[PDB]
Write a structure and sequence with these properties.
The complex is a heterohexamer, with 3 copies of chain A (about 240 residues) and 3 copies of chain B (about 270 residues).
Chain A (H helix, E strand, L loop, with lengths): L9 E6 L1 H4 L3 H14 L4 E6 L3 H12 L4 H22 L10 H6 L1 H7 L2 E5 L19 H12 L3 E6 L22 E3 H5 L9 H8 L6 E6 L5 H5 L7 E4 L6
Parallel strand pairs in A: 1-2, 1-4, 2-3, 4-6, 5-7
Antiparallel strand pairs in A: 6-7
Helix pairs in contact in A: 3-4, 7-9
Chain B lengths: L2 H10 L5 H8 L10 E6 L9 H14 L4 E6 L3 H12 L4 H23 L14 H8 L2 E5 L21 H11 L4 E6 L4 E2 L11 E2 L1 E3 H5 L10 H9 L5 E6 L5 H6 L6 E4 L2
Parallel strand pairs in B: 1-2, 1-4, 2-3, 4-8, 7-9
Antiparallel strand pairs in B: 5-6, 8-9
Helix pairs in contact in B: 1-2, 4-5, 7-9
The chains are: A alpha/beta (about 240), B alpha/beta (about 270).
The structure holds adenosine-5'-triphosphate (6 copies), molybdate ion (3 copies) and magnesium ion (3 copies).
Chain lengths: ~240, ~270, ~240, ~270, ~240, ~270
């Protein structure tokens, strides 16, 4: 049947890069909430790229670079957010860990300390899929691939919005945006407009082995990450299609 | 369409926005290594067969690199199938199987690189470029491992724990992202048939076929890994590949000279 | 006199590669016994190469490659067994650690978790000794060199047979095989036939500084590894020639 | 002065001893790469501007490397200023800011190196020499990141958390310690003026000036990082630098040919 | 105002290389005192270079090598002292850690064990400042830069002399050497003669952000390091110029 | 004898089986770098002596590499003896001493490589090949550290904690496993004598001798590390070595030209 769970007690939390882009006004409340969560969970904290990835895309695309070149350039920005977040949690014993370390030595590190910080981008690098000039396997996709491969207890996506809407709640179609309390990966995959998560996340969710639901919560509201890590419904729940017994 | 509109879309809109994706698709296309050719030496089909298969191909590589820039990727083979069997029986996920398969492809890159070392050709184990520009310029060839670096982030197949993206996909993706001019898979079969020639009495050789025609006849997972066909349809630089028999003397040399040996698979 | 003991509280366990070759039927009982041993000992678990090393020898020798090329090719297979074993113990905080890590940072890792997994092959690589086309310094030799250099409390070799016999208990001379409950490195070194351990192990045992005896036990019988780590005689004891006070 | 006296001083006396320092100053001076030139491609001034600025400079590098050995260092730019702003608002020290800035300079080295890869020019990401001797000998150019490797050991400025030693200092220090013959900073300005030409209506171009003359007129932190001027006064090998406008076609080529384009800044 | 403190509970101890040069007669008492200090403090132990750095300077200067070449050659000797010291403390869970590890993963390591050993030389390497043929940023400078960047609780310098004198207490001007119980970085910077600490240490002390005083104590007298880590005045106190509230 | 019998023995029988070992001994013998020469520059005997000894040897290396492929390994010297003395007094095992000795040999590789960098010759610090094939092909020489990589797995001597396999053994083992054509140890003595010429008044030079003859006269641990003699008797590719005085001008050049300077030690 299904493969085994490597780290079934692990909680994975993905921090959106645009949340980090807001500076200390957003980072300091989130840091204080993460400190109080350390005694309650074993945390793998993964950071996204944010606006700086858009700038290196703009320069790289203007230079004509392929998608296999842009993918690790954007990944680098997710790592800088990780070093920033880890530095703020260093007094609690948290450090940033590298992708080879996350792949092979995560069990020892979570035995030494309550949480580690890593990059959410996957190491696809020059082997990124063709088709689009924008790298598809980004921070959301990498965070779920890792959490599902580990068989983690859950994955929570921390955004700068309450969840997924029927339209961009910050774009030109703001007035017609209806909030979605719960949806599925296959429902979102058959839609057309933009989303706050990678569309490649929906594809890996269809073939998921363990993670049954992923919640998208607003990290700009203190407490929602705490509630989400306890299974409370405070954002958008995304059903992956995995059935439990 | 303009540079200013692409910039404003990249800053204001999400990367999933259809209008942002459409603007990025209009950007210029730069090939990093346009005059190079990516070759895959099959693990189970070639290297696992020992000197009777590897030695003539070493001679062709040394001879052909005088007129061609060659990126030489290695497959895995029976040792990776043994690792996959041990780990699948334990219920280990595809991400772990991917790491095990990489080491076997690293093994084959070592053995091939040590037979070519006295010709100056290095193994691109240790870095992942710059070792490649400098060596392609001076010695015209490099050896590398064909396994993709996904490791625990390996995209799993619809069912089963065997990694769907292995040494065929790894070599092709490198060819596509570097904008190389040619991709040649060196196997132990003359090419694609209407059936499996090892276990079929009456199969028919196919000199040229597209991906859509292969799917319409049940040849999706045959001589090539089935995700490679889907990657080929989405590629921008490498729009066709060639499968040749490495056990035939001079087949790699003649394929590099533009001869239509084996089977040419086109994206459309 | 003798050099000091770096890690005198360490127990080293070498898992034979041919034991790993038997798949889940052998690995799952051994994994379950290792989990129960974690609270009782500080373990350095080293894995051998097994049948896949014989295949790369067959290909490499057919290519004419020297012994310095075959040694790290076979070592790689011991590392794959290590990743497999570590993955099965990951939920208990165990991970695979690299040879530079084992050489310099083993003390910190065993302070963070109860056990780590490593490769039993030594990093002789291209500097392997000449003389034989088969690499002499293999999994047994590397495991003892490491345990004796550390001054570990002991080294236990986990095999697919009860111990050392007067002949191969699985070969053509099976009927005349007498089990050896206890022997010495110098006694075995003066014999001619095959052994379940490297013959280079006997040579490093002659110059040993701390390890007085090494027991070869059958890992296919659950409980014998537990008994061996308590000094119970359940296999073949190999006297090294070190005298204690 | 003799070798024996220097040895006895090095063994008996502290390294802070004035007589020991004076004896060491009399030692011979070996240049590691005397015939090479170190060039800095500005991050914000050049690479952040896209193909309109980078493509002509790629052409000049490919053309000029036929007659010159080139060490090509990259700046950081606006992405590093964004990282500095985020981290400074958090109160993070200069040592952390230095690590963040290195990654942006690594990014620009990647993009520049991929446009030069088909000419054989590698990126010195992965090792820190030997990749440099071999490539300078065979291909005549290497690309590297201009950020110094101080990381958390970054010497902080008198006030503020912005690292005072960035890509200008990193490129110059490499030029000085390798004994290179020339150092050229490629910016987006014709050179040094009596004021900031972007925000001043009446500034005057300065063709040549010394560090002491710059300090006496309030130009210490202008077109170059202000610690670079102090490092320049203490240098033994590179006693002058040249600042040129990379946006002018052929300016880098002509500067390498010995033409006095831009501003030459002398140590004394 | 000032930047934040990353590891405010950290104590940094720099061991002089010439103390290590004295062999087991000096190392074994210091090792025994360090073992007893492990339960009392969270220690980052940094080792200097010593006399072997003077030999590579002598060879390198005779070869005409620049200061950017000599700096990492001398740094290597500080790392060898670190491996030696870490090996003696390995039974207590201490290991030597690398400079990239000290920069990014120190928080996790000090969560796993009570102390780690590292090199006191900074990774200036080929980017060392010009001006002198002797590398200025050495073991004392690197140890303070790291401690001040971390915002550590203190930095103690362990020497082979009681502290700073008005002249070299072992040189030709020994009779006129007056012991300095307390001084400041700016007072020492305006002096001319030799010092037991780098003169670059005085320059980084002037721009210090957290460390208010650094004590230079004699590691050849057992107990003084213990007293110094408790703020007792048993050596030379160096005021940096940082004001506290 | 056949490939099939070797395969069946490798699968069914233990590697300690005498019949399996005998079958493997009949396999073909491939030399990886047959036309290269491995040279050891002594640490205490040469590099520790400064420019008077190193500079003429740098000139010979630059001159001789025009006609010879050179693998140049470095010794350790007095700094390693100091480390060995400190660590032995602490009771540290041979495996720890081996790590300390490697760093000193790494130091000497750095200093030698920086004097050769402007000639394109790199240091093989960072990778362990491919840096070697590419550089031997294009620049004809590489510098590497002569210490074996055994580290904590160092095979200890019969008594004492000093590592018995140091830079002499490390350079020889690399020569044997790469199938090089020649091995030259560059020391500070003309060759082997019937006694130690530094502390003996009447010693006699030995132009040529075998390992068995050396053991029969008490010269086992003299000018060469005593395990090197035993490794030499077991070697398949390098069956003799040559010891020359590096302090004599042109001795390395003439030894590479086939001149019988110094002492030739044969395996049998
Ligand atoms: N259907 C939608 N529902 C909600 N938000 C949307 C939708 N479509 C677009 N958005 C916009 O996407 C923004 C989130 O941007 P994005 O997901 O790119 O940043 P991020 O996830 O923090 O960065 P990274 O992916 O690098 O971690 C939201 O602020 C919102 O305005
Ligand atoms: N229609 C077909 N035509 C030709 N060959 C087919 C077909 N269907 C299946 N095959 C088989 O697929 C095999 C290709 O797989 P093979 O493992 O040899 O490739 P490889 O390069 O060795 O892969 P790896 O290197 O990962 O082991 C061929 O041996 C062939 O027998
Ligand atoms: N004298 C002997 N006593 C016991 N077993 C022997 C003897 N001689 C040969 N053998 C055989 O050797 C086999 C063990 O093989 P081997 O030691 O090569 O595997 P392993 O140690 O598990 O692998 P690795 O050394 O790679 O860890 C036993 O199953 C047994 O049949
Ligand atoms: N007196 C002056 N003359 C010329 N330019 C000046 C002067 N004073 C200030 N400047 C400004 O300083 C700027 C140089 O900084 P800039 O960031 O462009 O260099 P850079 O190489 O891009 O650095 P980095 O690569 O780290 O971003 C110029 O754009 C210029 O406008
Ligand atoms: N003003 C001074 N006060 C005290 N000692 C001095 C003074 N000037 C010189 N010295 C000498 O400096 C010696 C210390 O040497 P040094 O500081 O170079 O070694 P170290 O700090 O142990 O080595 P490293 O800096 O590599 O860690 C003392 O033994 C003392 O003799
Ligand atoms: N019979 C002998 N003939 C010649 N030299 C001898 C003899 N016996 C002893 N020696 C001495 O052995 C020494 C060789 O050791 P030496 O340390 O110089 O080699 P090395 O290459 O410097 O080693 P390392 O690089 O590890 O320091 C010579 O200096 C020589 O005086
Ligand atoms: O060095 Mo690890 O590989 O801190 O757990
Ligand atoms: O990074 Mo270490 O070197 O987990 O202990
Ligand atoms: O990066 Mo680490 O591997 O904390 O021991
Ligand atoms: Mg998002
Ligand atoms: Mg065995
Ligand atoms: Mg001092």
């Amino acid at each position: 049947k299904r493969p085994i769970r490597l780290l079934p007690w692990l909680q994975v939390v993905k921090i959106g890069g645009r949340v980090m882009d807001r500076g200390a006004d957003a980072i300091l409340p989130l840091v204080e909430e993460l400190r109080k969560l350390l005694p309650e969970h074993r945390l793998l904290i993964l950071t996204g790229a944010g606006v700086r990835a858009r700038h290196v895309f703009s320069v790289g695309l203007d230079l004509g670079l392929p998608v296999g070149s842009l993918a690790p350039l954007a990944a680098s920005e997710a790592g800088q957010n990780g070093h920033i977040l880890a530095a703020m949690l260093a007094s609690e014993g948290v450090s940033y860990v590298e992708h080879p370390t996350v792949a092979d030595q995560l069990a020892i590190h979570l035995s030494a300390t309550r949480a580690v910080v890593g990059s959410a981008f996957p190491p696809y690098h020059h082997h990124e899929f063709p088709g689009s000039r924008i790298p598809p396997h980004r921070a959301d996709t990498g965070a779920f691939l890792l959490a599902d491969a580990f068989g983690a207890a859950g994955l929570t996506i921390v955004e700068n919005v309450d969840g997924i809407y029927t339209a961009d709640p910050n774009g030109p179609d703001r007035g017609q945006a209806r909030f979605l309390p719960e949806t599925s990966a296959t429902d979102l995959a058959k839609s057309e407009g933009p989303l706050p998560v990678d569309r490649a996340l929906l594809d890996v969710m269809a073939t998921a082995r363990h993670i049954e639901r992923v919640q998208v919560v607003n990290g700009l509201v203190p407490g929602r990450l705490t509630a989400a890590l306890r299974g409370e419904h405070v954002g958008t729940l995304i059903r992956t299609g995995v059935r439990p017994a | 369409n303009s540079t200013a509109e692409l910039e404003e879309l990249l800053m204001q809109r999400s990367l999933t926005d259809p209008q942002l994706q459409a603007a990025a698709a209009a950007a210029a296309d730069f090939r990093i290594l346009p005059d190079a050719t990516v070759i895959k030496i099959g693990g189970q089909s070639v290297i696992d067969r020992g000197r009777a298969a590897v030695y003539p191909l070493v001679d062709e590589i040394v001879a052909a690199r005088k007129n061609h820039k060659l990126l030489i990727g290695t497959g895995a083979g029976t040792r990776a199938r043994h690792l996959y069997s041990i780990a699948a029986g334990l219920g280990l996920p595809a991400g772990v199987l991917a790491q095990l398969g990489s080491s076997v492809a690293d093994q084959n890159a070592a053995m091939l690189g040590q037979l070519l070392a006295k010709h100056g050709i290095p193994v691109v184990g240790g870095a992942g470029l710059s070792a490649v520009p400098l060596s392609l310029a001076e010695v015209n060839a490099v050896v590398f491992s064909g396994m993709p670096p996904y490791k625990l982030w390996m995209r799993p197949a619809a069912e089963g724990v065997i990694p769907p993206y292995r040494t065929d996909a790894g070599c092709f993706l490198l060819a596509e992202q570097f904008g190389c001019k040619q991709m040649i898979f060196v196997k132990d079969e003359d090419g694609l048939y209407t059936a499996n020639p090892k276990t079929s009495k009456d199969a028919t050789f196919i000199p040229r076929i597209s991906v859509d025609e292969m799917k319409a006849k049940g040849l999706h997972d045959s001589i090539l890994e089935f995700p490679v066909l889907d990657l080929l349809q989405s590629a921008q630089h490498v729009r066709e590949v060639q499968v040749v028999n490495g056990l035939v003397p001079g087949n790699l040399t003649r394929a590099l000279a533009g001869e239509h040996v084996g089977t040419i698979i086109t994206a459309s």
